[PDB]
């Protein structure tokens, strides 16, 4: 519902941090501040959606990602107001699904550099900033267009499955098939 939206942030930031060699449980106060995550029913899909999305956005707009992350350059004691002034431009740009992608991909970068800059309190609050923006500002647009299920499909099973036969069409069967050629490549 809403607590699952915090998962899409936290576990995603941890997904980037773990890649960088950092552990989320090491920087965030676990026992000192138990923030429980539910069973990822919807989260299982959307977190995969953003996982696949972060791939497409990165491979297609890696340069843009570089400029925007430098604009989101996390500083000592970053107020959420500054964070919002950036992420506002995601919505103000005519927020497409890629803005959500970008938003989640930004945190994935922010959380990392926050640790390198020895701001282990900021990496954790980054998740909070994202959860806030997602819950308050982003959710209205998301649900308006159908919800996460709409976005997930775009990088999910059926949408891609329908284009799977397109790969077979890409073959353009013009090669003389007389026997069974072992492997095409």
Curated annotation (Swiss-Prot):
Tissue: Bcl-X(S) is expressed at high levels in cells that undergo a high rate of turnover, such as developing lymphocytes. In contrast, Bcl-X(L) is found in tissues containing long-lived postmitotic cells, such as adult brain.
Protein name: Bcl-2-like protein 1
CDD domains on file: Bcl-2_like
Cellular component, GO annotation: Bcl-2 family protein complex; centrosome; cytoplasm; cytosol; endoplasmic reticulum; mitochondrial inner membrane; mitochondrial matrix; mitochondrial outer membrane
Effect of residue 98 to A: No heterodimerization with BAX
GO biological process, one term: extrinsic apoptotic signaling pathway in absence of ligand
Assembly behavior: Homodimer. Interacts with BCL2L11. Interacts with BAD. Interacts with PGAM5. Interacts with HEBP2. Interacts with p53/TP53 and BBC3; interaction with BBC3 disrupts the interaction with p53/TP53. Interacts with ATP5F1A and ATP5F1B; the interactions mediate the association of isoform Bcl-X(L) with the mitochondrial membrane ATP synthase F(1)F(0) ATP synthase. Interacts with VDAC1. Interacts with BCL2L11 (via BH3). Interacts with RNF183. Interacts with GIMAP3/IAN4 and GIMAP5/IAN5.
Underlying gene: BCL2L1
Function: Potent inhibitor of cell death. Inhibits activation of caspases. Appears to regulate cell death by blocking the voltage-dependent anion channel (VDAC) by binding to it and preventing the release of the caspase activator, CYC1, from the mitochondrial membrane. Also acts as a regulator of G2 checkpoint and progression to cytokinesis during mitosis. Isoform Bcl-X(L) also regulates presynaptic plasticity, including neurotransmitter release and recovery, number of axonal mitochondria as well as size and number of synaptic vesicle clusters. During synaptic stimulation, increases ATP availability from mitochondria through regulation of mitochondrial membrane ATP synthase F(1)F(0) activity and regulates endocytic vesicle retrieval in hippocampal neurons through association with DMN1L and stimulation of its GTPase activity in synaptic vesicles.
Domains: entry comment: The BH4 motif is required for anti-apoptotic activity. The BH1 and BH2 motifs are required for both heterodimerization with other Bcl-2 family members and for repression of cell death. The loop between motifs BH4 and BH3 is required for the interaction with NLRP1.
Lineage of producing organism: Eukaryota, Metazoa, Chordata, Craniata, Vertebrata
Pfam annotation, one family: BH4
Domain of life: Eukaryota
Family that this chain belongs to: Belongs to the Bcl-2 family.
Motif BH3 mapped to chain: 46-60
Keywords, alphabetical: Apoptosis, Cytoplasm, Cytoplasmic vesicle, Cytoskeleton, Endocytosis, Membrane, Mitochondrion, Mitochondrion inner membrane, Mitochondrion outer membrane, Nucleus, Phosphoprotein, Synapse, Transmembrane, Transmembrane helix, Ubl conjugation
Keyword set includes Mitochondrion: yes
């Amino acid at each position: 519902m809403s607590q699952s939206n915090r998962e899409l942030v936290v576990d995603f930031l941890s997904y980037k941090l773990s890649q960088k060699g950092y552990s989320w449980s090491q920087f965030s106060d676990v026992e000192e501040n138990r923030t429980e995550a539910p069973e990822g029913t919807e989260s299982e899909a959307v977190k995969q959606a953003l996982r696949e999305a972060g791939d497409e956005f990165e491979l297609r707009y890696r340069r843009a990602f570089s400029d925007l992350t430098s604009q989101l350059h996390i500083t000592p004691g970053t107020a959420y107001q500054s964070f919002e002034q950036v992420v506002n431009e995601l919505f103000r740009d005519g927020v497409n699904w890629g803005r959500i992608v970008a938003f989640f991909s930004f945190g994935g970068a922010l959380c990392v550099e926050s640790v390198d800059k020895e701001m282990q309190v900021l990496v954790s609050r980054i998740a909070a900033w994202m959860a806030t923006y997602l819950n308050d500002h982003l959710e209205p647009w998301i649900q308006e267009n159908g919800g996460w299920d709409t976005f997930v499909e775009l990088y999910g099973n059926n949408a891609a499955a329908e284009s799977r036969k397109g790969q077979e069409r890409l073959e353009h069967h013009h090669h003389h098939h007389l026997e069974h050629h072992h492997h095409h490549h």
